[PDB]
Enzyme design. Structure first.
Site, mmCIF file in Angstrom:
data_model
loop_
_atom_site.group_PDB
_atom_site.id
_atom_site.type_symbol
_atom_site.label_atom_id
_atom_site.label_comp_id
_atom_site.label_asym_id
_atom_site.label_seq_id
_atom_site.Cartn_x
_atom_site.Cartn_y
_atom_site.Cartn_z
ATOM 1 N N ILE A 149 -5.520 -11.233 17.073
ATOM 2 C CA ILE A 149 -5.316 -9.808 17.319
ATOM 3 C C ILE A 149 -5.494 -8.968 16.066
ATOM 4 O O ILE A 149 -5.378 -7.744 16.132
ATOM 5 C CB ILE A 149 -3.935 -9.519 17.944
ATOM 6 C CG1 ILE A 149 -2.822 -9.950 16.985
ATOM 7 C CG2 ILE A 149 -3.799 -10.184 19.302
ATOM 8 C CD1 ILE A 149 -1.427 -9.615 17.476
ATOM 9 N N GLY A 192 -5.339 -9.805 8.016
ATOM 10 C CA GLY A 192 -4.783 -9.163 6.841
ATOM 11 C C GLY A 192 -4.796 -10.034 5.601
ATOM 12 O O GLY A 192 -5.471 -11.068 5.568
ATOM 13 N N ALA A 193 -4.053 -9.617 4.569
ATOM 14 C CA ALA A 193 -4.015 -10.373 3.321
ATOM 15 C C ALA A 193 -3.455 -11.776 3.523
ATOM 16 O O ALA A 193 -3.860 -12.707 2.818
ATOM 17 C CB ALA A 193 -3.191 -9.621 2.272
ATOM 18 N N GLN A 194 -2.524 -11.953 4.462
ATOM 19 C CA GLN A 194 -1.972 -13.274 4.739
ATOM 20 C C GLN A 194 -2.741 -14.019 5.819
ATOM 21 O O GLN A 194 -2.242 -15.025 6.331
ATOM 22 C CB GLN A 194 -0.489 -13.194 5.140
ATOM 23 C CG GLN A 194 0.369 -12.062 4.562
ATOM 24 C CD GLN A 194 0.101 -11.733 3.110
ATOM 25 O OE1 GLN A 194 0.154 -10.565 2.717
ATOM 26 N NE2 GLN A 194 -0.137 -12.759 2.290
ATOM 27 N N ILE A 223 -4.867 -14.634 9.521
ATOM 28 C CA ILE A 223 -5.022 -14.251 10.920
ATOM 29 C C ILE A 223 -3.654 -14.102 11.569
ATOM 30 O O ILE A 223 -2.720 -14.864 11.288
ATOM 31 C CB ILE A 223 -5.891 -15.282 11.672
ATOM 32 C CG1 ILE A 223 -7.203 -15.527 10.924
ATOM 33 C CG2 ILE A 223 -6.204 -14.813 13.089
ATOM 34 C CD1 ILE A 223 -8.237 -14.424 11.118
ATOM 35 N N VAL A 224 -3.530 -13.102 12.437
ATOM 36 C CA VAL A 224 -2.387 -12.958 13.328
ATOM 37 C C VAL A 224 -2.871 -13.226 14.745
ATOM 38 O O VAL A 224 -3.926 -12.725 15.153
ATOM 39 C CB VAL A 224 -1.743 -11.558 13.219
ATOM 40 C CG1 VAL A 224 -0.557 -11.434 14.163
ATOM 41 C CG2 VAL A 224 -1.317 -11.287 11.787
ATOM 42 N N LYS A 235 2.073 -15.246 13.076
ATOM 43 C CA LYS A 235 1.454 -15.074 11.772
ATOM 44 C C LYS A 235 1.653 -16.348 10.970
ATOM 45 O O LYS A 235 2.741 -16.928 10.990
ATOM 46 C CB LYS A 235 2.090 -13.889 11.034
ATOM 47 C CG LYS A 235 1.397 -13.434 9.770
ATOM 48 C CD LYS A 235 2.160 -12.254 9.148
ATOM 49 C CE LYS A 235 1.352 -11.552 8.067
ATOM 50 N NZ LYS A 235 2.249 -10.776 7.157
ATOM 51 N N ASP A 255 3.761 1.821 0.748
ATOM 52 C CA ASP A 255 2.409 1.479 1.205
ATOM 53 C C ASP A 255 2.258 1.695 2.700
ATOM 54 O O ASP A 255 1.595 0.919 3.394
ATOM 55 C CB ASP A 255 2.043 0.040 0.836
ATOM 56 C CG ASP A 255 0.537 -0.263 1.021
ATOM 57 O OD1 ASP A 255 -0.312 0.638 0.807
ATOM 58 O OD2 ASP A 255 0.206 -1.397 1.414
HETATM 59 N N1 LIG Z 1 3.443 -7.867 15.725
HETATM 60 C C1 LIG Z 1 2.203 -7.384 15.865
HETATM 61 N N2 LIG Z 1 1.853 -6.853 17.053
HETATM 62 C C2 LIG Z 1 0.612 -6.363 17.200
HETATM 63 N N3 LIG Z 1 -0.392 -6.309 16.323
HETATM 64 C C3 LIG Z 1 -0.001 -6.852 15.157
HETATM 65 C C4 LIG Z 1 1.232 -7.385 14.846
HETATM 66 N N4 LIG Z 1 1.249 -7.845 13.531
HETATM 67 C C5 LIG Z 1 0.042 -7.582 13.089
HETATM 68 N N5 LIG Z 1 -0.758 -6.966 14.024
HETATM 69 C C6 LIG Z 1 -2.162 -6.530 13.918
HETATM 70 O O1 LIG Z 1 -2.777 -7.242 12.862
HETATM 71 C C7 LIG Z 1 -3.246 -6.318 11.848
HETATM 72 C C8 LIG Z 1 -3.057 -6.938 10.493
HETATM 73 O O2 LIG Z 1 -1.705 -7.331 10.323
HETATM 74 P P1 LIG Z 1 -1.061 -7.481 8.875
HETATM 75 O O3 LIG Z 1 -2.117 -8.028 7.986
HETATM 76 O O4 LIG Z 1 0.013 -8.502 8.973
HETATM 77 O O5 LIG Z 1 -0.457 -6.161 8.546
HETATM 78 C C9 LIG Z 1 -2.439 -5.050 12.100
HETATM 79 O O6 LIG Z 1 -3.073 -3.901 11.584
HETATM 80 C C10 LIG Z 1 -2.297 -5.036 13.615
HETATM 81 O O7 LIG Z 1 -3.489 -4.552 14.230
#
Ligand SMILES: Nc1ncnc2c1ncn2[C@@H]1O[C@H](COP(=O)(O)O)[C@@H](O)[C@H]1O
Length: 355
Positions: free
Chosen positions: A23, A26-28, A30-31, A46, A142
């Site tokens: 979905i 990010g830096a860490q 795939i979610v 995550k 941020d």
């Molecule tokens: N709990 C969550 N529910 C829905 N989308 C999420 C969630 N966590 C992360 N995302 C999606 O994943 C992207 C990157 O997440 P992150 O790198 O962890 O901030 C975000 O901009 C959201 O589109």
């Protein structure tokens, strides 16, 4: 207990988590979204890959784990489960966080032509979440559309706890920042910052929700400052004179700008104006924007004042259960200095404390 599934990287998760699908990124890494057959609900998953590999990432991961657990506020993303598939401290590699699943981040909402009711409700929720962080001693620093998530019923949660205040050293380093459009100007002016750095970001996000484009879209510090002064105007002589000499000379040498009046910058006809109520709300929205998008942080509105603003405060319900301040059991959460091996054990124990 576990099964491995490949998204773009392999996820080894508890059997209760089924149908994993990416979905976001990010830096860490795939979610994934997943269905939790045990709870009957959909969840986000995550994966933190060797978060103890270096001191910087270790401190960030440990802080996130401790805070996600201790905090329980409806506008901060909820942690539902934490686990590792590895069986011993020595073999410990990866941490999986299971979060409540939202529908989108705010980047998607910018194009959705929201009316006053939905816009003000999102802003109220954002300010509630920020207020809760500030009351816990956390300045986010941020905030941006990509780390704020929403459901289709217009509920909103802040995804992470932002950037701890840290001195950068040869061994405590700074991840490179890609998205700089929402950061308050006092940072690039060399002024240091206070809690209402977060209010500037909310102003930038609100402006983008209304206009459908990034308000201050600079390619570097120089370009960012130009885009700020072209719209808001050159700041006061007293403000400029208080800057450090090299910065002062540069900003005093720039061409001078009056600033675009907020009635022209955010005109009536980009807001709803069907009813007399809509016209009052447009004036209120513009008033709030003019109090958040203020270069001088000493004149910028506080989170507490923003929550009391007529545009926002219509959403305050006195009958709603408040959230208790978190009880962060690790006092020295920012004063921690550890070797890699000690961070690894600290993080492992945090993860095991959930099982
Ligand atoms: N709990 C969550 N529910 C829905 N989308 C999420 C969630 N966590 C992360 N995302 C999606 O994943 C992207 C990157 O997440 P992150 O790198 O962890 O901030 C975000 O901009 C959201 O589109």
């Amino acid at each position: 207990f576990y099964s491995v599934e490949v998204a773009d990287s392999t996820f080894t998760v508890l059997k209760r988590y089924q149908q994993l699908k990416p979905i976001g990124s990010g830096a860490q890494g795939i979610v994934c979204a997943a269905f939790d057959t045990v709870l009957g609900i959909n969840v986000a998953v995550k994966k933190l890959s060797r978060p103890f590999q270096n001191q910087t990432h270790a401190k960030r991961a440990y802080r996130e784990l401790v805070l996600l657990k201790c905090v329980n506020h409806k506008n901060i993303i909820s942690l539902l489960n934490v686990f590792t598939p590895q069986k011993t401290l020595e073999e410990f590699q990866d941490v999986y966080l299971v979060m409540e699943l939202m529908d989108a981040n705010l980047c998607q909402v910018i194009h959705m032509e929201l009316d006053h009711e939905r816009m003000s409700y999102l802003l109220y929720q954002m300010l509630c979440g920020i207020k809760h962080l500030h009351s816990a001693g956390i300045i986010h620093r941020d905030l941006k559309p990509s780390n704020i998530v929403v459901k289709s019923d217009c509920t909103l949660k802040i995804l992470d706890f932002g950037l701890a205040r840290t001195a950068c050293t040869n061994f405590m380093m700074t991840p490179y920042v890609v998205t700089r459009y929402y950061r308050a100007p006092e940072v690039i002016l060399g002024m240091g910052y206070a809690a209402n750095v977060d209010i500037w970001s909310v102003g930038c996000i609100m402006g983008e929700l209304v206009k459908g484009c990034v308000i201050f879209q600079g390619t570097d510090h120089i370009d960012q400052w130009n885009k700020v002064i072209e719209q808001l105007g050159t700041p006061s002589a007293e403000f400029m004179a208080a800057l450090q000499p090299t910065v002062r000379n540069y900003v005093e040498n720039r061409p001078k700008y009056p600033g675009i009046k907020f009635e022209e910058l955010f005109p009536d006809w980009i807001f709803p104006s069907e009813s007399e109520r809509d016209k009052i709300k447009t004036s209120q929205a513009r008033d709030l924007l003019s109090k958040m998008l203020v270069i001088d942080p000493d004149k910028r509105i506080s989170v507490d004042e923003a929550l009391r603003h007529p545009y926002i405060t219509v959403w305050y319900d006195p009958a709603e259960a408040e959230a208790p301040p978190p009880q962060i059991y690790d006092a020295q959460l920012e004063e921690r200095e550890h070797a890699i091996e000690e961070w690894k054990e600290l993080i492992y124990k945090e993860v095991m404390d959930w099982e």
